[PDB]
Design a protein around this motif. Structure first.
Motif, short mmCIF file in Angstrom:
data_model
loop_
_atom_site.label_atom_id
_atom_site.label_comp_id
_atom_site.label_asym_id
_atom_site.label_seq_id
_atom_site.Cartn_x
_atom_site.Cartn_y
_atom_site.Cartn_z
N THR A 20 0.82 -1.20 0.00
CA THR A 20 0.00 0.00 0.00
C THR A 20 0.86 1.26 0.00
O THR A 20 2.05 1.22 0.33
CB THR A 20 -0.91 0.00 1.22
OG1 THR A 20 -0.06 -0.01 2.37
CG2 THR A 20 -1.78 -1.26 1.22
N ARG A 21 0.23 2.39 -0.37
CA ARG A 21 0.78 3.76 -0.18
C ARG A 21 2.13 3.83 -0.89
O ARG A 21 2.26 3.36 -2.03
CB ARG A 21 0.82 4.14 1.31
CG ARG A 21 -0.29 3.59 2.17
CD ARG A 21 -1.59 4.20 1.78
NE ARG A 21 -1.81 5.48 2.44
CZ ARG A 21 -2.34 5.62 3.65
NH1 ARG A 21 -2.65 4.57 4.39
NH2 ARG A 21 -2.56 6.85 4.12
N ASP A 22 3.17 4.37 -0.25
CA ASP A 22 4.49 4.48 -0.86
C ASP A 22 5.44 3.37 -0.40
O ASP A 22 6.66 3.56 -0.42
CB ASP A 22 5.09 5.86 -0.53
CG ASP A 22 5.12 6.16 0.97
OD1 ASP A 22 4.68 5.30 1.78
OD2 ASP A 22 5.57 7.27 1.33
N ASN A 72 -8.86 12.88 -5.20
CA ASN A 72 -8.80 11.79 -4.20
C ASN A 72 -9.35 10.46 -4.71
O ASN A 72 -9.05 9.40 -4.11
CB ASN A 72 -9.48 12.21 -2.87
CG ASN A 72 -10.98 12.37 -2.99
OD1 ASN A 72 -11.47 12.89 -3.97
ND2 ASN A 72 -11.72 11.92 -1.97
N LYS A 75 -5.90 9.37 -6.40
CA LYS A 75 -4.61 9.90 -5.94
C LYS A 75 -3.65 8.79 -5.53
O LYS A 75 -2.44 8.95 -5.61
CB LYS A 75 -4.82 10.86 -4.74
CG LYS A 75 -3.50 11.66 -4.43
CD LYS A 75 -3.77 12.73 -3.43
CE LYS A 75 -2.48 13.52 -3.22
NZ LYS A 75 -2.75 14.57 -2.17
N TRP A 76 -4.18 7.66 -5.02
CA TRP A 76 -3.30 6.66 -4.45
C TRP A 76 -2.37 6.02 -5.47
O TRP A 76 -1.33 5.45 -5.07
CB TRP A 76 -4.15 5.58 -3.80
CG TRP A 76 -4.96 4.77 -4.79
CD1 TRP A 76 -6.22 5.07 -5.31
CD2 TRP A 76 -4.59 3.50 -5.34
NE1 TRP A 76 -6.62 4.03 -6.17
CE2 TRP A 76 -5.63 3.08 -6.19
CE3 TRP A 76 -3.44 2.71 -5.23
CZ2 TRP A 76 -5.56 1.88 -6.91
CZ3 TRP A 76 -3.38 1.52 -5.94
CH2 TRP A 76 -4.44 1.12 -6.73
N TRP A 77 -2.67 6.16 -6.75
CA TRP A 77 -1.74 5.66 -7.76
C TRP A 77 -0.43 6.43 -7.75
O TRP A 77 0.59 5.92 -8.22
CB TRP A 77 -2.35 5.78 -9.16
CG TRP A 77 -3.37 4.79 -9.40
CD1 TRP A 77 -4.73 5.00 -9.40
CD2 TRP A 77 -3.16 3.40 -9.67
NE1 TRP A 77 -5.38 3.81 -9.66
CE2 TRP A 77 -4.44 2.81 -9.83
CE3 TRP A 77 -2.02 2.58 -9.73
CZ2 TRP A 77 -4.60 1.45 -10.07
CZ3 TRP A 77 -2.18 1.20 -9.99
CH2 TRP A 77 -3.48 0.66 -10.14
N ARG A 80 2.10 5.00 -5.17
CA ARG A 80 2.33 3.59 -5.57
C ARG A 80 3.32 3.57 -6.74
O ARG A 80 4.33 2.88 -6.65
CB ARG A 80 1.01 2.98 -6.03
CG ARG A 80 0.73 1.56 -5.60
CD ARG A 80 0.42 1.44 -4.13
NE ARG A 80 0.86 0.07 -4.05
CZ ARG A 80 2.06 -0.31 -3.69
NH1 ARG A 80 2.95 0.56 -3.24
NH2 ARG A 80 2.35 -1.60 -3.73
N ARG A 216 -9.01 3.93 -3.47
CA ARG A 216 -8.19 2.90 -2.81
C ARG A 216 -8.92 1.57 -2.61
O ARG A 216 -8.33 0.65 -1.99
CB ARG A 216 -7.61 3.35 -1.47
CG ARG A 216 -6.68 4.48 -1.62
CD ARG A 216 -6.08 4.88 -0.26
NE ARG A 216 -5.27 3.79 0.25
CZ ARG A 216 -5.09 3.48 1.53
NH1 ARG A 216 -5.62 4.21 2.50
NH2 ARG A 216 -4.38 2.40 1.85
N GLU A 219 -6.87 -1.75 -3.67
CA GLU A 219 -5.51 -1.22 -3.88
C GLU A 219 -4.47 -2.32 -4.00
O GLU A 219 -3.63 -2.30 -4.92
CB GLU A 219 -5.15 -0.30 -2.72
CG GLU A 219 -3.74 0.28 -2.78
CD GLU A 219 -3.47 1.15 -1.56
OE1 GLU A 219 -4.25 1.05 -0.57
OE2 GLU A 219 -2.49 1.94 -1.60
N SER A 223 -2.53 -3.19 -7.56
CA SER A 223 -1.16 -2.65 -7.62
C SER A 223 -0.23 -3.55 -8.41
O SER A 223 0.54 -3.06 -9.24
CB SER A 223 -0.60 -2.47 -6.19
OG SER A 223 -1.21 -1.36 -5.59
#
Length: 265
Positions: A20-22, A72, A75-77, A80, A216, A219, A223
Motif C-alpha cells: 500500500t501507499r508508498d 482523491n 490519488k493513491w496511484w 504507488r 483505494r 488497492e 497494484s
C-alpha cells in the motif's frame, strides 16, 4: 532492466508489489501544481522518486478522475507508482463534470506539465509516457492513446466513453467491475477490450461496483498488475513479464470474475 536496471532483481516480487501507499523501492516526494498554474487541467500533485538517479531518465504517468469526483478518487496511484520509479501526476479536472474526451485533453496537458516542470522535467524521458483514469477518465485514457504516440501504455479503470474514439493499438490494461451499473461491461469495458488491437489485458473485479478501482478500493489487488504493466510497456522491463497475461493466473483469485489477455507480454 529495460530502463530500470536501478531496481534490483531481488526487489521485483509479488509480495513487494502487493502493498500500500508508498511502500516500494524508491523514496518519494510531492510537488503541488495549482489550478491557476496548470494550463489545460485543474492542477494536481506531482509524485517523484528522490533516489532514482541511477535509473537515468524516468517514465511519466498522468492519472485522471471520473465524473463528479476529484483527485482523491485516483490519488493513491501517485505514491504507488512513484515509489516504483515513475514520475506521476494525479490531477483535478477543470470541472468534475467534464466528459471523457475533455479528460483526454486534460491528461495530455498534464503530461506536458510534467515534461516542462522545473523540478521533474529534467528527470523525464518525454518519449516514455503513460495514462491512467477512472470512469470517464478511463474513457479519456483510451481517447488519448489514439492521439499521442508517446503514450506507451494506458490503464482504463471502470472505463466509460459514450462516443466513438477510434482504434487503440497502445498496450492497454483494462480494469473492469463485474457489477458496474454505470459503465456496464457489455457496452463499455468489454467492447473497448475486444476492439483494441495491440497488447491487451483485462481484469474484471468480482462483484465490483463502478467504484471498484477508485478511492483505494482493491488497492492491493490492482497494484501488482498495474505496476507490472506500466514497467513492461513504458520501461520495456521484461522482468515484470511474470506478473502479466498467461504468466500470472489472475482467474484463480476469488476477487477476479473474468480474466483475458492477448498479444502480451
Amino acid at each position: 532492466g529495460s530502463h530500470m536496471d536501478c531496481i534490483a532483481d531481488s526487489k521485483i516480487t509479488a509480495v513487494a508489489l502487493s502493498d500500500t501507499r508508498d511502500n516500494g523501492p524508491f523514496s518519494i516526494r510531492t510537488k503541488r501544481i495549482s489550478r491557476q498554474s496548470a494550463k489545460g487541467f485543474g492542477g494536481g500533485t506531482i509524485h517523484y522518486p528522490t533516489n532514482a538517479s541511477g535509473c537515468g531518465l524516468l517514465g511519466a504517468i498522468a492519472v485522471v478522475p471520473g465524473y463528479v469526483s476529484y483527485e482523491n478518487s485516483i490519488k493513491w496511484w501517485g505514491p504507488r507508482l512513484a515509489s516504483w520509479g515513475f514520475v506521476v501526476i494525479t490531477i483535478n479536472t477543470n470541472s468534475i463534470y467534464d466528459d471523457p474526451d475533455s479528460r483526454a485533453a486534460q491528461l495530455n496537458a498534464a503530461l506536458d506539465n510534467m515534461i516542462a516542470d522545473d523540478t521533474v522535467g529534467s528527470m523525464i524521458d518525454p518519449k516514455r509516457l503513460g495514462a491512467i483514469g477512472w470512469s470517464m477518465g478511463g474513457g479519456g485514457a483510451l481517447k488519448l492513446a489514439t492521439e499521442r504516440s508517446t503514450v506507451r501504455a494506458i490503464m482504463p479503470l471502470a472505463p466509460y466513453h459514450d462516443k466513438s474514439y477510434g482504434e487503440v493499438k497502445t498496450p492497454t490494461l483494462v480494469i473492469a467491475c463485474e457489477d458496474d451499473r454505470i459503465a456496464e461491461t457489455k457496452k463499455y469495458a468489454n467492447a473497448f477490450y475486444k476492439n483494441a488491437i495491440g497488447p491487451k489485458m483485462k481484469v474484471e473485479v468480482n462483484n465490483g461496483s463502478h467504484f471498484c478501482p477508485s478511492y483505494r478500493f482493491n488497492e492491493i489487488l490492482l497494484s501488482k498488475p498495474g505496476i507490472a504493466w506500466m514497467q513492461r510497456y513504458i520501461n520495456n522491463d521484461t522482468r515484470f513479464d511474470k506478473f502479466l497475461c498467461a504468466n500470472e493466473n489472475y482467474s484463480k483469485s476469488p476477487r477476479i470474475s473474468a480474466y483475458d489477455y492477448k498479444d502480451c507480454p
